[PDB]
Amino acid sequence: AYDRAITVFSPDGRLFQVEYAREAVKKGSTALGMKFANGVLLISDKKVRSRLIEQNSIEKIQLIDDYVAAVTSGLVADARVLVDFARISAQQEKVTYGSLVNIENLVKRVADQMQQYTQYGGVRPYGVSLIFAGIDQIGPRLFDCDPAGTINEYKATAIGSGKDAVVSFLEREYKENLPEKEAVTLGIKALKSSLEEGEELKAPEIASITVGNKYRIYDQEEVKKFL
Amino acid sequence: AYDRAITVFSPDGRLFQVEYAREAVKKGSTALGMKFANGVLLISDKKVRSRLIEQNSIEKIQLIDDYVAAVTSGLVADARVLVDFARISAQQEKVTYGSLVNIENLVKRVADQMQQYTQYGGVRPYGVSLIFAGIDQIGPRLFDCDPAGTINEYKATAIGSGKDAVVSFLEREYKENLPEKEAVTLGIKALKSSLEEGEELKAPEIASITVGNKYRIYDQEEVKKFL
Amino acid sequence: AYDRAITVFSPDGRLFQVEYAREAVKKGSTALGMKFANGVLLISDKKVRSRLIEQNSIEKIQLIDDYVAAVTSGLVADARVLVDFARISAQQEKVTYGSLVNIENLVKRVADQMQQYTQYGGVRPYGVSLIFAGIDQIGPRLFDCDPAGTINEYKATAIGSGKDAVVSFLEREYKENLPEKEAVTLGIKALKSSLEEGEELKAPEIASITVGNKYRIYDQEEVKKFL
Amino acid sequence: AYDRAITVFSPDGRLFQVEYAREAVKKGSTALGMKFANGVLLISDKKVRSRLIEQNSIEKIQLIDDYVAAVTSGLVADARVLVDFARISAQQEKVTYGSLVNIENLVKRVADQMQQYTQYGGVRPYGVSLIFAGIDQIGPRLFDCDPAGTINEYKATAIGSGKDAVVSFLEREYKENLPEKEAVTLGIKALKSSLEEGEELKAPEIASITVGNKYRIYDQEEVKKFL
Amino acid sequence: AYDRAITVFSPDGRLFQVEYAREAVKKGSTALGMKFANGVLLISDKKVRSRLIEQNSIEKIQLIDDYVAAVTSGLVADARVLVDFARISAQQEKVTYGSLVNIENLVKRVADQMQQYTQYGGVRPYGVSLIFAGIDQIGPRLFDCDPAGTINEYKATAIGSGKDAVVSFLEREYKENLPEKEAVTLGIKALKSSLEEGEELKAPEIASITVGNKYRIYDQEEVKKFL
Amino acid sequence: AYDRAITVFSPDGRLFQVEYAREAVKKGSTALGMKFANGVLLISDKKVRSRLIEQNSIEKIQLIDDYVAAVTSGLVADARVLVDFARISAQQEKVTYGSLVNIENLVKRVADQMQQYTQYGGVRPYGVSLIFAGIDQIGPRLFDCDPAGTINEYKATAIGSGKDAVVSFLEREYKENLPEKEAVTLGIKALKSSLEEGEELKAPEIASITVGNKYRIYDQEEVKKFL
Amino acid sequence: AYDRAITVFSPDGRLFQVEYAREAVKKGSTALGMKFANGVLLISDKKVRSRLIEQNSIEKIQLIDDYVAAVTSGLVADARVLVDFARISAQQEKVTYGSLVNIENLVKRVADQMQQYTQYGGVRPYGVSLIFAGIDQIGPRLFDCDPAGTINEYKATAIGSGKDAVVSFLEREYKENLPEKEAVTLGIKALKSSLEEGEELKAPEIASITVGNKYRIYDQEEVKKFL
Amino acid sequence: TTTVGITLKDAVIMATERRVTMENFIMHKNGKKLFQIDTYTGMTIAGLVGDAQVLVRYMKAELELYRLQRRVNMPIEAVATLLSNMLNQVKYMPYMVQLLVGGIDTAPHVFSIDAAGGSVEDIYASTGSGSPFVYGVLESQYSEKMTVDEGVDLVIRAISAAKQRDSASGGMIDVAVITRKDGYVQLPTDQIESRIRKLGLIL
Amino acid sequence: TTTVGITLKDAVIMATERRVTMENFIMHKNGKKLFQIDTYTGMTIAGLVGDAQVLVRYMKAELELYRLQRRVNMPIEAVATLLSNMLNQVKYMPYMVQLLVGGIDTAPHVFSIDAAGGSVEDIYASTGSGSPFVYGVLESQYSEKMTVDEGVDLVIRAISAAKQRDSASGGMIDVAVITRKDGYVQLPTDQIESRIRKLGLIL
């Protein structure tokens, strides 16, 4: 009888509404990313669909900036929306300082936005989870923004119905500084081991960046390699 | 007990209200469209009504711009309303850039609008679904905007009580680059196979556009052909 | 348990509140109109009342402009109100363009107004239905605006507890371009056949307009003719 | 379960709240008025009370302007309030046009005001009913404004717990153009026949106006005549 | 189930909330006043309390202006508040016209204020009742403003748990133009007869004014006289 | 079922919410003060706590101004808050008039503030009670402001779980103009007699002021005297 | 049935919502701090997690300013948010006065902020608790700000599921002016004794400051010492 | 635009002229300058047309409101004070006007209010381009004693000499008289001419 | 931009010219200056084009609204008062216009309203750069008695002499006539020329 408004704490002191949205995110297909030797990468599962759908518009991975990009998981509506804010915020950040200096305040802007919606009635939080990754004055970057505005910088993490199983893996197999291609497969394995018996990990999209270079999206054939 | 407000997530993490409007759309008569060799087309079922109704004002297909047009499916009220925003947004876009460059941000404007209404209390989302199609700096375009603000670019898709059955078809019969007239009938067949036994597909409206040309509405006799 | 707020969709995807107002309209006395050879006409039933009531203020028919006029059906309060907006909107339209060019955007302004009230909480839609008719740069015009903002241009239609029965008729008897007097009676018959056994169609008001001429209200004696 | 908010229609399409206020008015003491040969009059029942009450402040009849006046029936609070708006609106009207030209838009202003309060939540309609009467560029005037904003011009009408019975009378006895004194008594009779057996119509206040003359309030002795 | 919001009429057409505040007033100690030969007076019961309370701040009687003053009865909080508005309004009135001309619009300002709070949700009316009395361009004045904004000018009236019994008296004993001292005692008697058997009317405060003179508060000894 | 909103009167005409906050105040530790021969004093019980708490920040007594100070009792949060307003209001008062002339309008500002919150929905009143005391153009001052905005000037009073018992005392023992030290102990006794058997009145803080002098806080040793 | 809104007092006079958030804080891992001989320190437990998490972003301790820093405990979302306000408020304070003069009004700004959210509906308080510590014009400082806006300056205190047990200790072992290293361990012991049998106090972060010096974060090896 | 307002025993007179100028040009040889603003009150505009009229209306309306609900005229002073306030509340975006408020409440009053809002009561007051003349005649012909009719003549003798030097004033000479008994009462045109012809003037 | 409006017995005439200037330059030798603003009302713009037109529309619309819902034309004075108010409500951000409101309600009226909002009723009124001339002719040729046709001639004789000195007025001479019987009725071009040729003018 508490889980009805975004602004009511339970007797334990919980905000069931906010939680429920962390639940909507858990209904979205898995996706992880990890930094390595000069740069980071991102992997996203995608259970191929209607061949009538222009592949250009079904990539859980998006280029916010040339040197930064992210991936979402949850309500598709809220997905697009947040994505834009990122892209948009990116710019403002880029114009008041001459360049997207710290990828952090890009994620801040997004976190602060998402957070708000979890404190006022008349609104409902975003049922999305975003993983940002890129290169800034500092170097490889990886953050994961949840529905409640919570942000944490990783070396490797994931979102989606898999997350747990994918982190369970990395959390006992991941070894930093791997040479792109090696880190790529490790994650591929990690990702693999999150599916359910019988399922065959289809072709997942992947993108990377490396100190001094712009991102790049592995094309379905350079990807068909680690299969 | 959750399906009462547009801003309350269920324990699974669902927004039953938003869904219920995707349900209002499902009560509207079928309509699809697909791009082909230089251009796209649109087909809309219409169960002929009172001969006292000026046919000019019962066309689920509308010319937003000369080079772009769309079709709706759902609450008639919300139908008209959205249509205008499209037309209107079209212009603004057209005036700040000198021409409707990317048909995309026309659909963005509309998607962003519809999305909003699915996050604030005191409001209710549009029970409409729009399929946009036309020609831009890029070429043939086809998007389908749902009640929640979700947009996807297709090569062929549909909305309405049929959708599923019409996509079930195309999703296993559609073959790109068909010469207008050929693509026209394929869709006609697809459309046909969505009705219920006994029903006779009456005269459905159809319009098209082709790289370098303005749209055109097939007149009831040029249509009476593919019958 | 859904039919309580103007902003809540039912599990089928219906807006019971909005419907309920289409129900308030159905409690208002019948009234139709149809265009013919150069011009349109309007007929409204009126079950004569207290002779203490100045007949000037009980005419469901109103002259919005000299060349346009309308009729309502439903909550009397909302009736007057909307009427004004029409009259008022008329003007603005008339002053920004030098003349009421398209009778359409007069009906748009009214439709858009009425529509709004069916999407925000804290408000309630108008329980009125308006039938507009007149002459514009194009010619004879007839539109019917419902509580939800829905507008359609006809050649003949009606509103009120009769509507169905009156349209049931016209929808199988009406034949365009009739010479005023002929169209007048046809509608008179149609109207008649909407009453209940025993009832005697009393004197109903009627008005018309014809390409190049201002409207005119048939006086109770020129009307007493088609009895 | 519908009769709780001013903005919720019932399944029949009724606004029970608004009605309930037409019910508050029905708890106020009867009062009618009728125009005649050059001018109109007003009669109001008043069941004499505490002699400690300065008679100046218990007259259901009020002089809005010298040439116009009205009478209310219902919640005393809302009574005074509305009265002022009339008086006030009167002025504005009088100053933008140099004189209270049409007594109508005085009643419009009041009707439009009262109407509003029957369409927004957070508010409640006025439980009052006003009968206006006076002389304008046109001549004798009589309007009756109900809680919902509904206005109608009469030749004779009434408000209050009596209304029906008083109109029942006039509606079968009233004959226009009577010479003041004659119309005065007819109404007196009409008013009389609305009471309940045993009750003795005490001294009711009465006022009139006649083309070219200011109003005038019959003093308790000139009234004690028609007893 | 209606008596919950200030804006909901009951099926009889009552506003139970507003009433309930007329009930809060009925919990306040009695107090009356009456005009006489050139001027008016005011009497207020006060069941003497803690001798630790500076008598200066427990006088239900307050000097709004030198020539006007009032008395309240109900929620003490709302008591002070309103009092100020009176005092404050007094001034504005006094400054835009050079002098508090009609004591009436002082009471109007207060009535209009109090009325408002009985028509909008989100607010609650004042649980206070004020009796104003003084001298203006016209002469002796006495008004009684209730929670709903209702104002009436008297020759003698009262507020408080007594009112009825105190008016029951005056309403059959009061005789105008009495010489101050005489009117003083009559009210004293009237007041007395409102208590309950056993109770001994303690020392009640009293103040008066007389054409051309400022008010004056009878001191506890000049009062101890009429005991 | 009434005690739920700050704006709903009960059938008796009570505002249970507002009362409930006068209840929150009753959960705060006792504290009184009384004026005497040229000045006033204040005494506050404090059940000594953690020696880890800087005594500077646990004094229910606060210096609003050099010549004025107050003490609270209730919700600690609301406590601090109100305190500031006093301090703040003090200043504004002090700057528009050149000096804190009447300590009264300092208490007014605070009373008016606290009052408001007991009349609008969407808010909740302060669960605090403040006792102000000091020296102004007039001399010794003592006021006690309750949650509802009610203010009264005393010669001696108190707030807290004790109040009643402490006033019960003073109300039959207090004798004005006592020489500071004497008044000090009297209150000490009064305060004492409010505890419960077994309890030993620990060291309570005390401060005073005297015509022409700034306040002064008795230090724990000058206090340990009256023990 | 009261514990549902932030603005409703219970019959005892409690604000269960606000409490419930003091409950959310109690779900956060323990953390204390204490001033000593010229300066203060802070200790925070942290149950080491995924090695995939950049340690830089999991420090419950934050440098608001060079000379001031704080620690939180509760909802992680609200955690970050408040932290910023501190940092932000810090600056404004620092810029209007040329330097962060009193660390107090930094905590005020934060307390006042947090307080607000516990008095208006439509909002929900922060489920966080902050412990500030640093050096100002006065010297060592330590305050602890709770969800309701309550602030108190200590010599030693704590927040988190431990608090009680950690204060139970200090409240009977802490002895001021200890030489950094000594105070460090005392707290370490205190902290230790708050865990549950079996648990092994892992490596907790610690930072300090000393009159005339900027803060400093003990690195995991200088900390591994007091183990 | 010459106007004036003199007091007396239980009476007040207010007489204007009615010409609207625009330099060496005369738009109308007959406009309105004297209006009754309430049962026992009058007013004389003078200066900028627009503003003036708008004021009259803003006024007539307000006095009437009060009167209608309060059942008693408004004190001649409170009327001038009200006008005072309205004029000052926007003294920086003023009214190119200059009015006179005359009437009887308990006593015969006459107020001169300027574009600032400062209203001062006096014995007589002449507002207008030809007032220096009216102030010339009056400072050598007015007397507190004067009869109700000697007044109506004096006022005329003034605006009639004023019309002889002030290129801006002309036309007829509207006059009115407030008596506690007869209230505001404007004189008939013919009656005014009677007065003229006898003295020895033309126009 | 010469225009005029004369009253008579149960009739009102309003005649303009139609030239739009810009110094020693003439943009159009034929524009509109005389419009019917209501069943029994007319209006003559004069001065700044834009403003003027916007007003006409702002007007025609409002008169019509009233008329449509109230079923009775609006008093010629209330029309001038309405215009009055509108013009003054923004007298500091005025309309470089100067209009005339003529028509018949119960009697034949004619109002001259300025950029201030001051509207004054008169016998005749000439707005425009060539009005000093029309005011010259009229002060030596107008007579209250005049026939419905003698009027239509007088008006012309004026704007025709005006066109002889005012470098700003020219073109045809639009004239109209409001009769309680025939309401607003503009005369045919040919009919106007008839009048001209007879007098002895050219253009």
Q: What is the CATH number of the domain that holds H32?
A: 3.60.20.10
Q: Are the beta carbons of G153 and F127 separated by less than 8 Å? A: no
How many Cα atoms within 13 Å fall on the side-chain side of residue G209?
Answer: 24
3-state secondary structure of E33: strand
Spatial distance between the Cα atoms of H87 and H94, rounded to a whole number of angstroms: 7
Looking up tokens 């969505």 gives B194
Residues of chain G in contact with residue F20, where contact means CB-CB under 8 angstroms, are 9-11, 13
Residue A150: alpha-carbon gap to chain centroid: 13
Ramachandran angles phi, psi of F152, nearest 5°? -140, 135
Nearest CA-CA partner of I112 in H29, D10, G56 = H29
Q: Do A52 and B156 touch (CB under 8 A)?
A: yes
Q: Report the DSSP pairing between strands C31-36 and B68-71.
A: unpaired
Using the beta-carbon criterion (under 8 Å), do H61 and D91 form an inter-chain contact? yes
Judge contact between E61 and E67, C-beta under 8 A.
no
I1 is catalytic: yes
Backbone dihedral angles phi then psi of residue B14, each to the nearest 5 degrees = -105, 155
Q: Are the beta carbons of A25 and B13 separated by less than 8 Å?
A: yes
Give the list of residues 6+ apart from residue B73 with CB closer than 8 angstroms, or none.
B25, B28, B29, B30, B31, B60, B79, B128, B129, B130, B159, B160
Name residue H190's amino acid: D
* Residue reference for tokens 């801003």: B7
Residue G216: beta bridge partners?
Answer: G208
* CA distance linking residue F197 with residue H4, whole number of Å: 89
Asked if C132 and C106 count as a contact pair (C-beta separation under 8 A), the reply is yes
Distances (CA, A) of H36 to E98, H19, H71: 22, 19, 18
Helix (H, G, I), strand (E, B) or coil at H192: helix
Please give the span between the terminal C-alpha atoms of chain B, in angstroms, as a whole number: 48
> Token pair of A61, please?
């991975």
DSSP assignment string, I140-201: TT--TT--HHHHHHHHHHHHHHHTTT-TT--S---EEEEETTTBS-BPPHHHHHHHHHHHT-
| Cα nearest neighbour of I139 on chain H | H29
Between chains, do B124 and C122 touch, taking CB under 8 Å as contact?
no
| Of A103, A93, A123, the residue nearest A17 (C-alpha) | A123
Non-local (6+) Cβ contacts of C128 within 8 A are: C24, C25, C28, C72, C73, C74, C75, C78, C79, C82, C114, C147
Q: Tell me, yes or no, if C76 comes closer than 8 A to chain I by beta carbon.
A: no
**Cβ neighbours of E76 in F, within 8 Å:** 148, 150
Distance CA A2, CA A21 (A): 15
Residues of D in contact with E112 (CB under 8 A): 81, 84
Sign of the Cα pseudo-torsion (G26, G30, G34, G40, in order):
negative
CA nearest neighbour of H179 among H104, H123, H122 = H104
Q: Are strands C156-159 and C151-153 parallel, antiparallel or unpaired?
A: unpaired
Asked whether the beta carbons of I44 and I16 are under 8 A apart, the reply is yes
**In this structure, which amino acid lies at residue C128?**
V
Give the dihedral sign, CA F135/F137/F143/F149: negative
To the nearest 10°, report the CA torsion of E177, E183, E186, E188.
Answer: 150
Contacts 24+ apart (CB under 8 A), G89-95: G90/G64, G90/G65, G94/G65
Whether residue E25 contacts residue E128, with contact meaning beta carbons closer than 8 Å, is answered with yes
Amino acid at E90: A
Which of E120, B76, B149, B84 lies closest to C118, judged by CA? B76
Separation in Å, CA of B4 to nearest CA in chain C: 7
CB B213 within 8 Å of CB B69: no
Q: Read off the tokens for G158.
A: 């704590």
Q: Is A102 exposed, middle or buried (0-12, 13-18, 19+ CB in 10 A)?
A: middle
What distance in Å separates the CA atoms of residue D202 and residue D57, rounded to the nearest whole number? 18
Between strands E31-36 and E156-159, the pairing is antiparallel
Identity of the residue in G50, G77, G123 whose CB atom sits nearest the CB atom of A171: G50
Estimate the share of chain I in helix, then strand, then coil, as percent rounded to the nearest 5: 35, 25, 40
Q: What is the DSSP letter of D219?
A: P
C-alpha span between I48 and E197 (Å, rounded): 86
Chain C residue closest in CA terms to I60: C95
Backbone phi and psi for residue H80, each to the nearest 5 degrees, phi listed first: -70, -35
| Tokens 């019994």 belong to residue | E165
CA distances from G102 to B205, E123, F6, G83 (A): 75, 41, 38, 18
Looking at beta carbons, which pairs linking I162-166 to residues 24 or more positions away fall under 8 Å?
I162/I2, I162/I17, I162/I128, I162/I130, I162/I131, I162/I133, I162/I134, I162/I137, I163/I2, I163/I17, I163/I130, I163/I203, I164/I133, I165/I130, I165/I133, I166/I2, I166/I128, I166/I129, I166/I130, I166/I133
Question: From CA D180, how far away is CA D208, in angstroms rounded?
Answer: 8
Are H179 and H10 within 8 A, CB to CB?
yes
Q: What are the distances in angstroms from CA D65 to CA D58, D216, E66? A: 18, 12, 34
Considering CB atoms only, which of I72, I82, I105 is closest to D97?
I82
**Among candidate residues A94, A116, A112, the one with its CA nearest the CA of residue A103:** A94
Nearest to I51 by CA among I1, I122, I108, I12: I1
Q: Is D97 in CB contact (< 8 Å) with chain H?
A: no
Q: Kindly determine whether residue I75 and residue D102, on different chains, have CB atoms separated by under 8 Å.
A: no
**C-beta of residue B152 within 8 angstroms of C-beta of residue B144:** yes
Catalytic residues of H, by residue number, are: 1
Q: Scanning the structure block, which residue is given the tokens 């004569």?
A: C48
- In Å, how far from its chain's centre is CA A47? 17
What CATH number is attached to the domain comprising E153?
A: 3.60.20.10
Region class of G122: left (phi > 0), else alpha (psi between -120 and 50), else beta? left
State the maximum Cα–Cα separation within chain I, in Å, rounded to a whole number: 48
Q: How far apart are CA D144 and CA D166, in angstroms?
A: 14
Count up the domains in chain B and report the number: 1
Query: Residue E59 CB: number of other CB atoms within 10 A?
Result: 14
Q: What angle do CA F130, F206, F168 make, to 5 degrees?
A: 65
* Of residues I70, I81, I85, nearest to D102 (C-beta): I70
Give CA angle at H186 (H181, H192), nearest 5°: 120
Cα(G31)–Cα(D219) distance, integer angstroms:
87
Q: How many CA atoms lie within 13 A of E56 on its CB side?
A: 8
Query: Which stretches of E27-180 are DSSP H helices?
Result: 76-96, 104-116, 163-170
* Cα–Cα distances in angstroms (integers) from residue E110 to residues D58, E126, E147, in the given order: 19, 11, 10
8 A C-beta contact, residue F71 and residue F159: yes
Query: Would you list the DSSP string of F133-196?
Result: EEE-SS-EEEEEE-TTS-EEEBSEEEESSSHHHHHHHHTTT--TT--THHHHHHHHHHHHTTS-
User: What is the spatial distance between Cα C9 and Cα B21, in angstroms, rounded to a whole number?
Assistant: 7
- Count CB atoms within 10 A of the CB of residue E221: 8
What is chain D's Cα-based Rg?
18
Smallest CA–CA distance from H56 into chain D, residue: D95
Among the partner-chain residues E8, E122, E153, the one whose CB lies closest to the CB of D4 is: E8
> Residue A154's closest CA among G52, G76, G46, G47?
G52
Residues found in chain G: 227
- The strand pairing partners of D35, in sequence order, are D40
A13 to chain G, closest Cα gap in Å:
4
Strand ranges (DSSP E) for chain E? 31-36, 39-44, 61-62, 68-71, 130-135, 140-145, 151-153, 156-159, 205-209, 216-218
Q: Which residues pair with G133 in a beta bridge?
A: G69, G142
C199 to C191, C194, C195, C202: CA distances (angstroms): 12, 10, 6, 9
G32 and G72 in contact (C-beta within 8 Å)?
no
Q: What is the pairing mode between strands H175-179 and H124-127? A: unpaired
Does D96 sit within 8 Å of I82, measured CB to CB? yes
> Is the Cβ of G49 closer than 8 Å to some Cβ of chain A?
no
Rounded to 5 degrees, φ, ψ at F177 are: 60, 15
Q: What is the dihedral of CA G192, G194, G195, G197, to 10 degrees?
A: 100
Q: Do F148 and E51 touch (CB under 8 A)?
A: no
- The token duo for E67 is 């020539």
Query: In whole angstroms, what is the distance from residue D103 CA to residue I70 CA?
Result: 10
Q: Are I152 and I177 in contact (CB under 8 A)?
A: yes
- Run of H or E including G7: none
Map residue G76 onto helix, strand or coil: helix
Which element (helix H / strand E) includes H91? Answer: none
Asked whether the beta carbons of residue C27 and residue D34 sit closer than 8 angstroms, the reply is: no
Q: What is the rounded CA–CA span in Å between residue D65 and residue D57?
A: 17
The residues, ordered by sequence, that sit 6+ positions from G161 with a Cβ below 8 Å of its Cβ are G26, G27, G28, G29, G30, G194
D123 reaches E (C-beta below 8 A): yes
β-pair partners for E151: E145
The answer to whether A208 touches A39, Cβ cutoff 8 Å, is yes
In whole angstroms, give the CA distance from residue C46 to residue C61. Answer: 11
Resolution (A): 4.0
Q: What is the torsional sign of CA I98, I103, I105, I106?
A: positive
d(CA B22, CA B16): 10
Give residues after which chain G gaps, C-N over 2.5 angstroms: none
Closest by alpha carbon to F28, among F135, F151, F129?
F129
Report the DSSP beta bridge partners of residue E205.
E44
> Is the four-CA dihedral B3, B7, B10, B12 of positive or negative sign?
positive
Residues G144, G159 contacting (CB under 8 angstroms):
yes
Q: Find chain I residues with C-beta within 8 A of C95's C-beta.
A: 57-58, 60-61
Q: For residue C57, what are the domain limits? A: 1-227
∠ Cα G115 G120 G126 (to 5°): 45
DSSP H helical ranges for chain H: 49-70, 76-88, 131-138, 148-162, 189-199
Supply φ then ψ for residue A136, to 5 degrees: -130, 180
Instruction: Compute φ and ψ for A191, nearest 5 degrees.
Output: -55, -50
> Rounded to whole angstroms, how far apart are CA atoms B23 and D22?
40
Chain G contact for A90, CB < 8 A? no
What's the CA gap between I19 and I128, in Å, rounded? Answer: 11
SS (H, E, C) chain C: CCCCCCCCCCCCCCCHHHHHHHHHHCCCCCEEEEEECCEEEEEECCCCCCCCECHHHCCCEECCCCCEEEECCCCHHHHHHHHHHHHHHHHHHHHHCCCCCCCHHHHHHHHHHHHHCCCECCECCCCCCEEEEEECCCCEEEEEECCCCCEEEECEEEECCCHHHHHHHHCCCCCCCCCCHHHHHHHHHHHHCCCCCCCCCCCCEEEEECCCCCCEEECHHHHCCCC
Residue E59 near chain H (CB below 8 Å) = no
Distance CA G128, CA A107 (A): 22
Cα separation, H4 vs H127, in Å, equals 6
C115/B84 Cα distance (integer angstroms): 13
First to last CA, chain H: 16
Answer for the pair A120, A93: CB distance below 8 angstroms, yes or no. Answer: no
* Nearest Cα residue in chain C from I39: C66
Nearest to A19 by CA among G21, B12, G16: B12
The CA distance from B169 to B23, in Å, is 22
Place of tokens 């007040």: H12
Q: Which of H81, H82, H119 to mutate: most E Cβ within 10 Å?
A: H81
What H or E segment, with its residue span, contains residue E227?
A: none
Phi–psi pair at D102, nearest 5 degrees = -105, 120
d(CA H23, CA H44): 21
Select from C6, C12, C170 the Cβ nearest to the Cβ of B23: C12
Angle made by CA atoms F98, F101, F103, in degrees to the nearest 5: 135
Strand partners, G159: G31
D99/H contact by beta carbon, under 8 A: no
Largest CA distance in chain G: 54
> Who among E22, E58, E77 is closest to F149 (CB)?
E77
Q: Cα-atom radius of gyration of chain E, to the nearest Å?
A: 18
| Contact partners, residue F174, CB within 8 Å, separation at least 6 | E52, F34, F155, F156, F186, F190
Nearest-by-CA chain G residue for A144: G53
